[PDB]
RNA sequence: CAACUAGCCCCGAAAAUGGAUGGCGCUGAAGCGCGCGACCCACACCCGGCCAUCUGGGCGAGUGCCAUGCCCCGAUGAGUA
RNA sequence: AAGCAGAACUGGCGAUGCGGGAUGAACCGGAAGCCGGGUUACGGUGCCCAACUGCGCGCUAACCUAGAACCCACAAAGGGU
RNA sequence: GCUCGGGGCGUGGACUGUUGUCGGCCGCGCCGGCGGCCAAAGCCCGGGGGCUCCGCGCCCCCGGCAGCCGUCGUCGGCACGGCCGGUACCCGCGCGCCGAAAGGCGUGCCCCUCGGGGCACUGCGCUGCAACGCCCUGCGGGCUCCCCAUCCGACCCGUCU
């Protein structure tokens, strides 16, 4: 199911509704970038 | 003037934004010149920051120990004043709400009619003054 | 006459065309920004989507034997906190109209 | 099919009009587009307002290419023989009388064209050549 | 508070290492965070700096929230606080009057922001320990409520009300 | 979502019923379907193209559906309406019936207020809280076919004849409509006078003052 | 909350009495662009928050910059409170385009009162220096205290200002008394006409 | 997914109540993770190694 | 009462064509630090329409013929030397 | 010391507009077909100038330079009951 | 039997502009449910403790309870609009009946066993609907200059660099 990965090849996501958190910082400092399980799904549900 | 500030329980307040959008509250406990713990009888308490909420003239007499239920008892004792407050006596907002809900066919028809009756009164009064003048 | 009733010459609630949709740098004339009079908030201006707009103007020349001409449009969606709205017109409004009043009708009513 | 494609071409217009830079202040410098070769041109660098450059994307729909706004395909018709080819099309193609052709020979083209039912612009060109405004 | 303010998170963990009879336990400094996003990084960092474990050998069991402690009313959070200015970290002990944990964070954050010039790279606190109204010792904010809670002095300076205007 | 759910989690439950009813006859349009119809002897060119037939049938049904429900917000026959667009806009009028076209028959009584019978669109209208009782009014005479405005074919007469220019292109008052309108209006007046001061109110007109909000105003 | 003052269908007259100079200038300028016809009255009586020293020195350095290396032809400083106010609006509004020139021409400055505008000018939603202040909030300095130190137009103005105020004050009070009196007998005369039903719904619609 | 949380609801009882008024934690039991990831590119290809 | 810590403000801080937080002006800021929402907003991003280019198809069995044609794809396209 | 001379790595400019930094070849955001509609970035929301004179909590009173956005248009030791 | 014209009847076609609608895409505001976070703020009832030791009062904890809460996740429902297109081969759909209309009308099966539901069962033919103006009287329009609005305007291009 790493061959049930074997994707389309890009999901072409929309730019997020309500915008991003700042690009210049990582997740800890109130930026967007890097790991976060809870808030990635929130972001992807703005990028419908 | 950074509203009414003090040290004492019982001073009623009136909305200048919150949530709630109606609501009148009393200050049960006191916590600097900005924050106040506000509650109302059958309504959920909040301790909230209010640089921009101002307190009204009327005070109700209540003491320390504030449950939810204690507040209700005081309101029953008072009551009466609240009705007057809406129209005139500090608040004025609650009577203003009534104006908006009064543009609704039957209500609007009646509303216009009031003004027409008033028109007649102005003419009648004016005659009395006019005769005296000339 | 027919279509006539018993008073109000002003049929509409008032509005104003401030400008066009804009950066500091550039304008896009395709969408116009109108601040609608008496509209204080974002919630209130949400009502105005779908309504018809008329810019009525007078001109020196006659046309089909009338000096009065009009450009029609429609309200697309709200813009900003202050009760500004976005609008498109069939042909763009003349940008000399910055600072003019324009008319926003009740005409197709959602309510 | 054909009808909404016509509407898209005519109403939208990329009649941008590709003017050469500084054509306005040098009379001899031609209106006709030629590509700014030098780096130093603003037009080359693709600054907006400096007159946008011709590119393929400006191009119209394939069907609506070389069509008269009537949705007819324009054909300049030299003589009577060429009208027979146009007859096959009828609606699709148009007849327009050539510049070279003189007034008497225009008349025979018009009367034949009428039989094909490709009356549009053919008649109009002839009528002026007679005497008419 | 509504749309948070920075809830203090009771962060649950381990210290995951080796199939040996030993194991470190989790240790906590109770940290204000935004939700999970802010919480995870500092949780590793407290362990890493002090004792060292790693980040991958730091395991997060759960994150648990907070529910109303102080019943809206006031109790006197004793905070020892560290602000980074011109060098390393400097001592402060501010014991203050506050609503609850949301608000407690706000009051310290503003004091640091103004006085010590402070943003996220400054650390939080050392410990939080409530104390009773008469007992609490330092000054300014606490005194006004303290005098009210045991009364007689509820009934002092009641005169500003109606006299804010004029009367 | 909620109306469409039966069809969505069925797929073609309504259309299944029709086939099985046809099959209740016995053995039928499986056999007939192959045999059925015309073809083979063309016109002009390939004949690649279009309509009559099949296509018309779902489209007519779908266009009918907006007339209540979607446009309507809710409105029962005899609701008082505000016409916000149309010619007669700003007049409050009483709702007679909804047509097959989807346009509404209205009529304010002609003498008091100028509104004739007329067709107006549902989309324009604000539904007010008032209802006037249309219990015993004969709205029946006025129908969808009643409202055909004659075109400029020729003279209004039988046809085939050389005609004169004195046609009404964008207008036409039939004489019959004027006679009929008086009768229907008479019943309405009785209902209108029953509630006081409604009669004057309809003609006066509603419009929004400066400072008035159309959002807050909602009847 | 909702702004009761600003753009109006027709009703733009603006009070400058104890307003904030730049706060008023900013909002007025926006209205002028919007095509409104703004008449600012009581222009000299507008206030600028801050100590006299720092308000004064701002104009003083501008005077030095006007003063020297001389043609004429541009560098200028206005001596008058009305023309300082005009200059402020001519910094708000694009002063390099015909539309902004037209907007500038819809501004009027009247000192004291124009020839009788018997409708009062009414305060702009909290624009004022007085209220926006707890009382104090340190000092303020009037335009009329600045402009006396810069030269003529104020010097002639100040004597004249007093005269207009005295005359209009007297008349305004006496009409108020009679106007008020009408209302007192109005309630009696709403009872008197048999009674009323509809009109006693009216104080429930305050 | 829900029954994983339900399992630790049943087993654990030492985590929730007292621990807000204290630091550290005790024993009991631990919930595993096992998660694939989704990666969306926030920042462009400009100016990076 | 004393010694400190560090914020802003003041001093230290004086140049010539007059002058520049870009300007006006701003003092419970429109300042300064910071938080929270809402909102504004590039030829960017998405969806749709459309152009060419490239890629993959497809359709000639002749007797309408461009078969280097026509038609369906989807992605891509700044551009000096 | 230098907007200096010379290397190491990388990205740009050169071959780069557009949006942002008032303004700026190189900084920031992003590489750009042609359009409609949506949605953002950078940066903003008193007015200029599109956009909250929005909410919240502090600090600041500057007659010897109040203060006001990386690069960047300078600035320090040291002093203040 | 056909065609030109006339007679006689029915349907209504002429650039271009406008309005209604169905579908697709996208935004828009608002309303509702459940679970997570042992659930608990909460209130009444009950019990004990501390602090205060001047007592009110304050706090803390535990057991029964209308209750309603901030945050996480998910589903559910409405009300409107922009834009594009009218779906030209399997997108959609009709072909017996009634019903202006929309819409419904078979039967078996099973769950519910109530209200209703889900689930099974024939082949062909085929993709744009409502309205207004006028086409000629007369006029929409296109194009150029100008004025007003708006804007990159690094001076115009080339070259060197």
From TrEMBL, chain A:
The source's domain of life comes to Eukaryota
Q: Which family does it belong to?
A: Belongs to the universal ribosomal protein uL30 family.
**Name under which the protein is recorded:** Ribosomal protein L7
Automatic annotation (TrEMBL), chain F:
Query: Which CDD domains does the UniProt record give?
Result: KOW_RPL6
Q: Which Pfam families match?
A: Ribosomal_L6e
Q: Which organism is it from?
A: Triticum aestivum
Output the superkingdom of the source species: Eukaryota
* Family the entry assigns: Belongs to the eukaryotic ribosomal protein eL6 family.
Q: What is this protein called?
A: 60S ribosomal protein L6
User: Would the keyword Metal-binding be found if you checked this record's keyword annotation?
Assistant: no
Query: One GO term of the cellular component aspect?
Result: ribosome
Return the PANTHER family for the record. 60S RIBOSOMAL PROTEIN L6 (PTHR10715)
The protein's UniProt keywords, in alphabetical order, are: Ribonucleoprotein, Ribosomal protein
The GO biological-process annotations, alphabetized, read as: translation
Entry-linked Gene3D superfamilies: 2.30.30.30
Mind listing the GO molecular function terms for this protein? structural constituent of ribosome
Coiled-coil boundaries:
none
TrEMBL record, chain G:
Q: Which GO terms describe its molecular function?
A: mRNA binding; structural constituent of ribosome
Show the Pfam families listed in the entry. Answer: Ribosomal_L13 (PF00572)
Q: Which UniProt keywords apply?
A: Ribonucleoprotein, Ribosomal protein
Q: A single GO CC term, please?
A: cytosolic large ribosomal subunit
Which InterPro entries does this one have? Answer: Ribosomal_uL13, Ribosomal_uL13_CS, Ribosomal_uL13_euk/arc, Ribosomal_uL13_sf
* Any one GO biological process: negative regulation of translation
Does the keyword field hold ATP-binding?
no
Work out whether the entry's keyword set contains Ribonucleoprotein: yes
- CDD domains given in the database record: Ribosomal_L13
Q: Which family does it belong to?
A: Belongs to the universal ribosomal protein uL13 family.
Under the heading PANTHER family, the entry gives:
LARGE RIBOSOMAL SUBUNIT PROTEIN UL13X-RELATED, RIBOSOMAL PROTEIN L13
Q: What is this protein called?
A: Ribosomal protein L13a
Lineage of the species this protein comes from: Eukaryota, Viridiplantae, Streptophyta, Embryophyta, Tracheophyta
Quote the gene name from the UniProt entry.
Answer: LOC606336
């Amino acid at each position: 199911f790493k061959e049930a990965n074997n994707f389309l090849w890009p999901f072409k996501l929309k730019a997020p509704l309500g915008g991003l958190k700042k690009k210049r910082n990582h997740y800890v400092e109130g930026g967007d970038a890097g790991n976060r399980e809870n808030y990635i799904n929130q972001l992807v549900r703005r990028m419908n | 003037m950074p509203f009414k500030r003090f040290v004492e329980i019982g001073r009623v307040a009136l909305v200048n934004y919150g949530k709630d959008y109606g609501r009148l509250v009393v200050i049960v406990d006191v916590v600097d010149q900005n924050r106040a713990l506000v509650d109302a009888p059958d309504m959920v308490r909040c301790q909230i920051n209010f640089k921009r909420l101002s307190l009204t003239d009327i005070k109700i007499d209540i003491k320390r120990v504030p449950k939810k239920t204690t507040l209700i008892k005081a309101m029953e004792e008072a009551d009466v004043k609240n009705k007057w407050e809406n129209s005139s006596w500090g608040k004025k907002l609650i009577v203003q709400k009534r104006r908006a809900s009064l543009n609704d066919f039957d209500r609007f028809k009646v509303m216009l009619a009031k003004i027409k009756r008033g028109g007649a009164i102005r003419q009648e009064l004016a005659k009395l003054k006019k005769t005296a003048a000339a | 006459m027919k279509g006539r009733q018993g008073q109000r010459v002003r049929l509409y609630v008032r509005g104003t065309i401030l400008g066009y949709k804009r950066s500091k740098s550039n304008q896009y004339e395709n969408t116009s920004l109108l601040q609608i009079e008496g509209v204080n908030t974002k919630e209130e201006v949400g009502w105005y989507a779908g309504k018809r707009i008329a810019y009525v103007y007078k001109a020196k020349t006659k046309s089909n034997d009338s000096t009065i001409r009009c450009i029609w449009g429609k309200v697309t969606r709200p813009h900003g906190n202050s009760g500004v709205v976005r609008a498109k017109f069939r042909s763009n409004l003349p940008p000399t109209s910055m600072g003019k009043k324009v008319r926003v009708f009740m005409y197709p009513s959602s309510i | 099919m054909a009808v909404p494609l016509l509407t898209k071409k005519i109403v939208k217009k990329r009649v941008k009009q590709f003017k050469r830079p500084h054509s306005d202040r040098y009379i001899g410098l031609k209106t006709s587009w030629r590509r700014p070769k030098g780096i130093d041109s603003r037009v080359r660098r693709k600054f907006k307002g400096c007159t946008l450059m011709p590119n393929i994307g400006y191009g119209s729909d394939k069907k609506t290419r070389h069509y008269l706004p009537n949705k007819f395909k324009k054909f300049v018709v030299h003589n009577v023989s060429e009208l027979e080819l146009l007859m096959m099309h009828n609606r699709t193609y148009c007849a327009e009388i050539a510049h070279n052709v003189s007034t008497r020979k225009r008349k025979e083209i018009v009367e034949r064209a009428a039989q094909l039912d490709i009356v549009v612009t053919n008649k109009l060109a002839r009528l002026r050549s007679q005497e008419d405004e | 508070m509504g749309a948070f303010r920075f809830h203090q998170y009771q962060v649950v963990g381990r210290g995951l290492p080796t199939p040996t009879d030993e194991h470190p336990k989790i240790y906590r400094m109770k940290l204000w965070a935004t939700n999970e996003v802010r919480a995870k990084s500092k949780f590793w960092y407290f362990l890493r700096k002090l004792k060292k474990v790693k980040k991958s050998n730091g395991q997060i069991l759960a994150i648990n929230e907070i529910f109303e402690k102080n019943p809206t009313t006031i109790k006197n959070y004793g905070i020892w606080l560290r602000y980074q200015s011109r060098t390393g970290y400097h001592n402060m002990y501010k014991e203050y009057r506050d609503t609850t944990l949301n608000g407690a964070v706000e009051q310290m954050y503003t004091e640091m922001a103004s006085r010590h010039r402070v943003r996220f790279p400054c650390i939080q606190i050392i410990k939080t320990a409530t104390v009773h109204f008469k007992l609490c010792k330092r000054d300014n904010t606490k005194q006004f409520h303290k005098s009210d809670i045991k009364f007689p002095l509820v009934y002092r300076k009641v005169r500003p009300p109606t006299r804010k205007l004029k009367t | 979502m909620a109306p469409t759910s039966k069809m969505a989690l069925g797929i073609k439950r309504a259309s299944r019923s029709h086939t099985y009813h046809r099959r209740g006859l016995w053995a039928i349009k499986a056999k007939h379907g192959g045999a059925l119809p015309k073809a083979e002897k063309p016109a002009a060119i390939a004949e690649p193209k279009f309509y009559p037939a099949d296509d018309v049938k779902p489209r007519t049904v779908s266009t009918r559906k907006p007339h209540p429900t979607k446009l309507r917000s809710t409105i029962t026959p005899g609701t008082v309406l505000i016409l916000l667009a149309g010619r007669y806009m700003g007049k409050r009028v009483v709702f007679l019936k909804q047509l097959q076209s989807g346009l509404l028959l209205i009529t304010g009584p002609f003498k008091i207020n100028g509104v004739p019978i007329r067709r107006v669109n549902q989309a324009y209208v604000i539904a007010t809280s008032t209802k006037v009782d249309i219990s015993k009014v004969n709205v029946q005479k006025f129908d969808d076919k009643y409202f055909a405005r004659e075109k400029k074919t020729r003279a209004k007469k039988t046809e085939g004849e050389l005609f004169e220019s004195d046609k009404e292109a964008t207008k036409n008052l039939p004489d019959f409509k004027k006679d009929d309108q008086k009768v229907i209006d008479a019943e309405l007046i009785k209902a209108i006078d029953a509630v006081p001061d409604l009669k004057n109110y309809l003609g006066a007109r509603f419009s929004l003052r400066d400072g008035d909000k159309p959002h807050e105003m909602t009847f | 909350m909702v702004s009761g003052s600003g753009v109006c269908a027709k009703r733009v007259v603006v009070d400058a009495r104890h307003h904030m100079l730049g706060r008023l200038a900013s909002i007025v300028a926006k209205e002028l662009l919007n095509g409104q016809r703004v008449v600012v009255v009581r222009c000299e009586e507008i206030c600028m928050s801050g100590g006299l020293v720092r308000q004064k020195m701002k104009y003083l350095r501008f005077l030095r910059k006007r003063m020297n290396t001389k043609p004429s032809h541009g560098p200028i400083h206005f001596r008058a409170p009305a023309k300082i106010l005009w200059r402020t609006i001519r910094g708000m509004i694009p002063h390099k385009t015909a539309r902004g020139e037209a907007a500038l021409a819809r501004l009027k400055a009247y000192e004291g009162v124009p020839p009788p505008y018997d409708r009062t000018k009414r305060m702009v939603i909290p624009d004022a220096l007085k209220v926006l202040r707890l009382q104090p909030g340190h000092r303020y300095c009037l335009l009329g205290q600045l402009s006396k130190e810069v030269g003529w137009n104020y010097a002639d103005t100040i004597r004249e200002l007093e005269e207009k105020r005295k005359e209009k004050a007297k008349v305004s009070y006496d009409r108020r008394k009679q106007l008020a009196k009408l209302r007192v007998k109005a309630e009696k005369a709403a009872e008197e006409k048999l009674g009323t039903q509809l009109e006693i719904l009216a104080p429930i619609k305050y | 997914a829900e029954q994983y949380a339900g399992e630790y609801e049943a087993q654990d009882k030492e985590l929730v109540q007292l621990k807000r008024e204290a630091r550290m934690k005790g024993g009991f039991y631990v919930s595993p993770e096992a998660k694939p990831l989704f990666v969306v590119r926030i920042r462009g290809i400009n100016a990076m190694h």
